[PDB]
Design a protein around this ligand. Structure first.
Ligand SMILES: [Zn+2]
Length: 768
């Protein structure tokens, strides 16, 4: 039985790729140096995989910035504004990713959005009405395939398929084309590429059609037939094709599968959806290979070999060993490079982890174990012992947490009274005028804020010295808010680096790494916390700063928390228990924090859930509904312990809520802030259609621009929102936190914002 890896993380052991890209963008190294570093990394990673024993090794998975972006260039789908700049291929590539300035003209980047339900971001194919396609000179997949071959590595090239390419695309400015209608123009180019790959020596190709996990509109469904007939019709002139899917099941799209009857194999994610195995087996053509995705490409836990082998033997029994491939569930770009780089983890947790280097070995070990378990019996025994150790650990058997969870009731999820009763108490308590003004949370993160934070964590300044600095920063924020005449204050979060790490460090059940970076957005990476055990709160987490802030504040002061869904989803979660169990533990820990804030002079508490929408299962049905039920219940459990006179606020970083506005409404938040300033006011129609009965602050100030909007601009924006929202429900606030802005920009913009609010207060004042 063969082993397979769908993709390897690109950044390198020490984020070598990030260092090189950025050094190139800062003119410290030449194009030749950067490309050579790219080559060095690809070679090092191919070697890791071959040394591990991997039979089917990927190529074309590497990217300097983004693989979808690679495909845009590969198919000459580049808009005029980039090609007219007459740049080198590399500089044109980066121009689409980051932006570029040739001459007096400043060329912005293409839109980047999240890749399915991951934290990875891809560049959307951005297409013209008159779009045609052709294969780029020196096509990347062929180039990298031959490079691998020359260095002794036979590889399997990875393409994003034609249907997904367009499905994930959009019409450019000045165009209205529905991208999928360009299929007939694109398919020939894939056929030409596959012919070149085959002539270069590629025996098979991995073609990702990840949109198969979506609910597909009929136009997209109908695209698979012509696209894959064209590929099959090329016969032996193209490589064998394995169609790949991940991050969800495909059992709702069995009507699409006949399009792949001329393909050699199908890859399914059996980590996310193990239950899809046997229904999928029944849908395979008589000679088709199952690529069984059994090693998790999305998390950092050692594989359960015995569990994986049971799954694999089911496949082997049904199909025969020659029709089964042991594979990673998805690409490993979503995992860190290697566990060996971690020198400060607790000794007991090491044996539970596998990062990318460890995972590529795992597929080889499993593949060997399918037919010859004796050859790896010592490794199989070690694996079983690791899983047993995790099961038996004190970390995963906290009796107090278990007991607390067992006693949770439905009623504890609900506020003491509905909004219509609550609001009267809130109104007088907070003493809010019409059009109350506030901000979202963070204030400018200055050089000295970062410097002082670093010195404290390194131990170069004492706890007492740091706390005094934090006091002074909070005093400053409050002094500025006093001068601005804002109605509800924040403390600025000068003590906080990252909205999930800050909480992870102050909860039981978490561990932190030093080197476990994952590519997120071009060359920006994240280093997620890891949940290893049952979660609880040993001490107040944010009370000290909020308590001090309230002690000097003439206005209501916002408590500031990250919700249980985000504390969960923006970490690597456990796999030994269901995510709902983990989220509930977090919800109870945060419930305690909320109550502690309220006991310390805080009566406006903002709980933000930016991972909420991201966690949505990728298709509609019982799994999506199950997620929303526990995600919503977790937020409610965390926030429902407050008095009626306390306000619960929540900020959302989007302007559209397709599908899940019902979930937002089920949160029962008193006040909602949303991003809106750069969007058309017509998006606020959802609040009318859903008859939203509670309070709303659609952002009126674009915080991602250093420009100070004028008084008249703020007034015009407020007027536009009032076309959709009732005066009594309207809050006046920025689009988001202010960490990325400077204080001069903040003072100017917020001064104008408050003045605009005051103007409307007079316009809407009672007549004589
Ligand atoms: Zn936001």
């Amino acid at each position: 039985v063969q082993s397979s890896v769908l993709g390897f993380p690109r950044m390198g052991v020490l984020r070598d790729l990030k260092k090189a890209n950025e050094a190139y963008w800062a003119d410290k190294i030449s194009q030749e140096a950067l490309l050579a570093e790219g080559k060095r990394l690809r070679l090092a990673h191919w070697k890791i995989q071959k040394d591990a024993g991997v039979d089917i090794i990927p190529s074309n998975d590497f990217a300097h910035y983004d693989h979808v972006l690679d495909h845009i260039q590969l198919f000459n789908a580049v808009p005029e504004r980039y090609t007219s700049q007459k740049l080198s291929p590399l500089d044109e590539y980066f121009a689409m990713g980051r932006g570029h300035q040739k001459g007096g003209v400043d060329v912005p980047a293409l839109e980047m959005v999240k890749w399915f339900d991951s934290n990875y971001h891809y560049v959307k194919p951005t297409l013209q009405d008159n779009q045609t396609f052709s294969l780029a000179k020196d096509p990347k997949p062929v180039r990298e395939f031959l490079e691998a071959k020359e260095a002794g590595f036979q590889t399997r090239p990875v393409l994003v398929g034609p249907v997904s390419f367009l499905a994930l695309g959009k019409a450019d400015r000045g165009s209205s084309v529905d991208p999928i209608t360009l299929l007939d123009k694109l398919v020939p180019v894939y056929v030409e590429l596959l012919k070149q790959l085959k002539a270069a020596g590629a025996e098979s190709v991995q073609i990702d059609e990840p949109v198969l996990v979506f609910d597909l509109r009929p136009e997209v469904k109908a695209a698979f037939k012509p696209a894959y007939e064209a590929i099959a019709a090329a016969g032996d002139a193209v490589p064998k094709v394995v169609v790949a899917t991940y991050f969800g099941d495909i059992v709702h799209n069995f009507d699409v599968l006949p399009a792949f009857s001329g393909a050699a194999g199908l890859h399914v994610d059996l980590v996310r959806n193990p239950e899809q195995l046997e229904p999928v087996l029944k849908q395979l053509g008589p000679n088709q290979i199952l690529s069984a995705g059994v090693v998790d490409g999305r998390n950092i836990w050692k594989n359960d070999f015995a569990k994986s082998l049971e799954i694999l033997q089911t496949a082997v029994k049904a199909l025969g060993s020659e029709r089964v491939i042991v594979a990673t569930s998805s690409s490993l770009i979503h995992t860190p490079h290697t566990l060996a780089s971690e020198k400060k983890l607790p000794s007991d947790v090491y044996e539970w982890f596998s990062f990318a280097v460890e995972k590529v070995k795992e597929v080889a070990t499993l593949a060997k174990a399918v037919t010859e378990p004796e050859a790896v019996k010592a490794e199989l025994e070690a694996n079983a012992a690791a899983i047993k150790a995790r099961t038996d650990s004190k970390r995963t058997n906290d009796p107090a947490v278990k007991e607390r969870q067992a006693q949770v009731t439905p009623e504890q999820h609900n506020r003491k009274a509905p909004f219509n009763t609550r609001y009267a108490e809130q109104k007088k308590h907070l003493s809010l005028p019409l059009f109350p003004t506030t901000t979202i949370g963070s204030f400018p993160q200055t050089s000295e804020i970062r410097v002082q934070r670093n010195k404290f964590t390194k131990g170069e300044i004492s706890a007492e010295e740091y706390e005094r600095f934090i006091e002074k920063e909070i005093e400053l924020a409050v002094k500025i808010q006093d001068e601005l005449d804002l109605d509800v204050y924040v403390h600025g979060e000068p003590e906080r680096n990252d909205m999930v790490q800050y909480f992870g460090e102050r909860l039981n059940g978490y561990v932190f790494t030093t080197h476990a970076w994952v590519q997120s957005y071009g060359s920006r990476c994240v280093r997620p916390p890891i949940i290893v055990g049952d979660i609880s709160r040993p001490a107040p987490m944010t009370v000290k700063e909020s308590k001090y802030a309230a002690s000097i504040s003439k206005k209501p002061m916002k408590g500031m928390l990250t919700g249980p869904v985000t504390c969960l989803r923006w970490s690597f979660p456990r796999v030994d228990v269901h995510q709902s169990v983990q989220c509930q533990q977090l919800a109870l820990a945060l419930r305690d924090e909320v109550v502690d804030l309220e006991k310390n002079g805080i009566y406006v508490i903002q709980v933000d859930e930016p991972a909420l929408r991201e966690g949505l299962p990728l298709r509609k049905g019982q799994e999506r509904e199950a997620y929303l039920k526990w995600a919503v219940d977790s937020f409610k459990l965390a926030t429902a312990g407050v008095e009626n006179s306390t306000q619960i606020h929540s900020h959302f970083c989007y302007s559209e809520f397709q599908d899940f506005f019902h979930a937002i409404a089920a949160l029962d938040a008193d006040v909602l802030s949303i991003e809106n300033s750069k969007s058309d006011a017509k998006l606020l129609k959802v609040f009318i259609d859903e008859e939203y009965p509670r309070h709303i602050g659609p952002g009126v100030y674009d915080i991602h621009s250093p420009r100070v909007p004028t008084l008249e601009e703020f007034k015009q924006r407020i007027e536009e929102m009032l076309a959709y929202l009732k005066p009594e429900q309207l809050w006046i606030n920025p689009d988001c936190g202010l960490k990325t802005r400077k204080w001069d920009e903040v003072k100017g913009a917020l001064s104008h914002m408050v003045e605009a609010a005051k103007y409307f207060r007079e316009k809407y004042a009672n007549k004589a």
